[PDB]
Design an enzyme around this catalytic site. Structure first.
Site, PDB file in Angstrom:
ATOM      1  N   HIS A  64      34.340  38.870  28.741  1.00  0.00           N
ATOM      2  CA  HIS A  64      34.758  39.964  29.663  1.00  0.00           C
ATOM      3  C   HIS A  64      34.254  39.687  31.091  1.00  0.00           C
ATOM      4  CE1 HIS A  64      35.898  42.307  26.038  1.00  0.00           C
ATOM      5  NE2 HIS A  64      34.640  42.118  25.578  1.00  0.00           N
ATOM      6  N   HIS A  89      26.150  40.631  36.499  1.00  0.00           N
ATOM      7  CA  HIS A  89      27.482  40.103  36.130  1.00  0.00           C
ATOM      8  C   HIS A  89      28.438  40.451  37.271  1.00  0.00           C
ATOM      9  CE1 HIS A  89      27.416  44.275  34.503  1.00  0.00           C
ATOM     10  NE2 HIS A  89      28.574  44.331  35.137  1.00  0.00           N
ATOM     11  N   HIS A  91      32.748  41.147  38.740  1.00  0.00           N
ATOM     12  CA  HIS A  91      34.119  41.643  38.497  1.00  0.00           C
ATOM     13  C   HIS A  91      35.009  41.077  39.601  1.00  0.00           C
ATOM     14  CE1 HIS A  91      32.672  44.719  35.530  1.00  0.00           C
ATOM     15  NE2 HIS A  91      31.639  44.810  36.366  1.00  0.00           N
ATOM     16  N   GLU A 102      35.447  46.815  41.790  1.00  0.00           N
ATOM     17  CA  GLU A 102      35.625  48.064  40.997  1.00  0.00           C
ATOM     18  C   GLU A 102      35.606  49.276  41.941  1.00  0.00           C
ATOM     19  OE1 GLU A 102      33.090  47.476  37.380  1.00  0.00           O
ATOM     20  OE2 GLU A 102      35.238  47.366  36.762  1.00  0.00           O
ATOM     21  N   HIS A 115      27.219  43.478  39.941  1.00  0.00           N
ATOM     22  CA  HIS A 115      26.389  44.555  39.354  1.00  0.00           C
ATOM     23  C   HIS A 115      25.066  43.993  38.842  1.00  0.00           C
ATOM     24  CE1 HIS A 115      30.250  46.943  38.559  1.00  0.00           C
ATOM     25  NE2 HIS A 115      29.772  47.154  39.791  1.00  0.00           N
ATOM     26  N   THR A 196      31.289  50.934  33.580  1.00  0.00           N
ATOM     27  CA  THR A 196      32.721  50.696  33.957  1.00  0.00           C
ATOM     28  C   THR A 196      33.414  49.919  32.835  1.00  0.00           C
ATOM     29  OG1 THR A 196      32.331  48.632  35.086  1.00  0.00           O
ATOM     30  CG2 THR A 196      32.067  50.713  36.379  1.00  0.00           C
ATOM     31  N   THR A 197      32.677  49.571  31.800  1.00  0.00           N
ATOM     32  CA  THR A 197      33.234  48.874  30.623  1.00  0.00           C
ATOM     33  C   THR A 197      32.856  49.711  29.404  1.00  0.00           C
ATOM     34  OG1 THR A 197      31.297  47.509  30.063  1.00  0.00           O
ATOM     35  CG2 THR A 197      32.831  46.631  31.731  1.00  0.00           C
TER      36      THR A 197
END
Ligand SMILES: CCCCNC(=O)c1cc(S(N)(=O)=O)c(Cl)cc1NC1CCCCC1
Ligand SMILES: CCCCNC(=O)c1cc(S(N)(=O)=O)c(Cl)cc1NC1CCCCC1
Ligand SMILES: [Zn+2]
Ligand SMILES: [Zn+2]
Lengths: 260, 260
Positions: A64, A89, A91, A102, A115, A196-197
């Protein structure tokens, strides 16, 4: 199983993960109408962010995102509770639409977002235990735009070709994580939100820095093109792209700002 | 049951309405990265939009929006099939955040959005039947911003106090629907998408006009404060606010413009 595309995508997360259809979901669009100045939002202190250059930290492709494990001696000071680091991690988007942050600011996506995930070490004994509990988590969010090459971000990006496929890992030497943070970290947005996941728990105190950092066109294109959400043995690879959640209703909530 | 807020809100629509988790979802952010000029896109012609003043048209609060019933002899020319009018309705925000359009342009929300819903009368006996076949519906979208008082929109807004609660109805005398349309209608965005409400069927040909219309401060505030999503006999009334869907992912797809 959840994805950012098609039947198993974000509109269907609530089928598998109840909190994803719940209250206080992240991310949100940061716009004038829901901002409120708060003078009690004082500078955070980043403590133990200068990681031991003699130590190596695990980078993983978990299907992911790409995740760097962080040590619990790294923490935020300034909040009511101490929050200890657990991982960072990213995005991002894709080469045809390189707008994959995000959080948005006045409806505008940045290229990408970092993040840094912290858990409430005063209340909970680990980040897993913390994640589904009251005041369990705190995330620092860094908005990333296309610009100057970033030597600090390259301490991560330089290893992407060694975590291309789901479940692959690479060691990263200690560096100063504070180098990943933008100018004037005193200027930030603060609000109560969620992961957010999946599982989307509404347990996160969010800090989004006002100022973006830059990485180069080529650093951005590496991130967008290096990684696959499939295993190395899978003869039908899928690219890891557009791994960002759409912005959520912000009903009743306000965003507090350290600046005006 | 579906709403725009709390636990039956848009993240949960897919539980009972699987197409809300499916392909070709609307609305979308109209931004440069996914726009293509297409010179083959010619002006729509609005036929029988001048409704008979001697006829009355049913205004209803269906608990989700205020809907005006339209006659099948009202139609659009210039698509591949004749699309006959079935209804129009509106989406809006709230007085604390007056940004309630469904479509966004370069991330900017407008104050409100009008939809004029048509059905393919050459292929289908009625709108209900057309609504779950591809190219079954065509919708005209008008973006709405605060500005000068709009006498044409007031032909609808002057009736809101008679449809305050769910199930309530009023009659509106025929007027020229074309007066609700912006300047230079030949300039539009065009793409294949869905209903923006349950059941979210992927069956709409979208036209979003490039240029917004204006309504006054007091008109938008009336729209935002007049109506409830609950029945008059409900002891827990709910103000009808924020009745707009968040923008959807738009991956590996284009919006065509009629303008360069
Ligand atoms: C790495 C990306 C894929 C999956 N998501 C996460 O790992 C993840 C993402 C976020 S975020 N995206 O910052 O809201 C947060 Cl706050 C927490 C997460 N995990 C928990 C970390 C503490 C232990 C429980 C797991
Ligand atoms: C907004 C009112 C709440 C309920 N939704 C609808 O009435 C509705 C909204 C849209 S939209 N917002 O334009 O995409 C479309 Cl295309 C079609 C709809 N319904 C009919 C369903 C079958 C008969 C034909 C039309
Ligand atoms: Zn994240
Ligand atoms: Zn609509």
């Amino acid at each position: 199983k959840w994805t950012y595309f098609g039947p198993d995508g974000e509109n269907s997360w609530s089928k598998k993960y109840p909190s994803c259809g719940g209250l206080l979901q992240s991310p949100i669009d940061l716009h004038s109408d829901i901002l409120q100045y708060d003078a009690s939002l004082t500078p955070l202190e980043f403590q133990g962010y200068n990681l031991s250059a003699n130590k190596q930290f695990l980078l993983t492709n978990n299907g992911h995102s790409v995740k760097l494990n962080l040590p619990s001696d790294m923490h935020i000071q300034g909040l009511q509770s101490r929050y200890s680091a657990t991982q960072l991690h990213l995005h991002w988007g894709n080469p045809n639409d390189p707008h994959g942050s995000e959080h948005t600011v006045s409806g505008q996506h940045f290229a990408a977002e970092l993040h840094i995930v912290h858990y409430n070490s005063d209340l909970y004994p680990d980040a897993s235990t913390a994640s589904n509990k009251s005041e369990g988590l705190a995330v620092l969010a860094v908005l990333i735009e296309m610009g100057s090459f970033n030597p600090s971000y390259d301490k991560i990006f330089s290893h992407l070709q060694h975590v291309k496929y789901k479940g692959q890992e690479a060691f990263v030497p200690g560096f100063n994580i504070e180098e990943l943070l933008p100018e004037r970290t005193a200027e930030y947005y603060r609000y109560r939100g969620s992961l957010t996941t999946p599982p989307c728990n509404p347990t996160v105190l969010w800090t989004v820095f006002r100022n973006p950092v830059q990485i180069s066109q080529e650093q951005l294109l590496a991130l967008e093109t290096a990684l696959y959400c499939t295993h190395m043995d899978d003869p039908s690879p899928r690219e890891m792209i557009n791994n960002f959640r759409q912005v959520q209703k912000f009903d009743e909530r306000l965003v507090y700002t350290s600046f005006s």
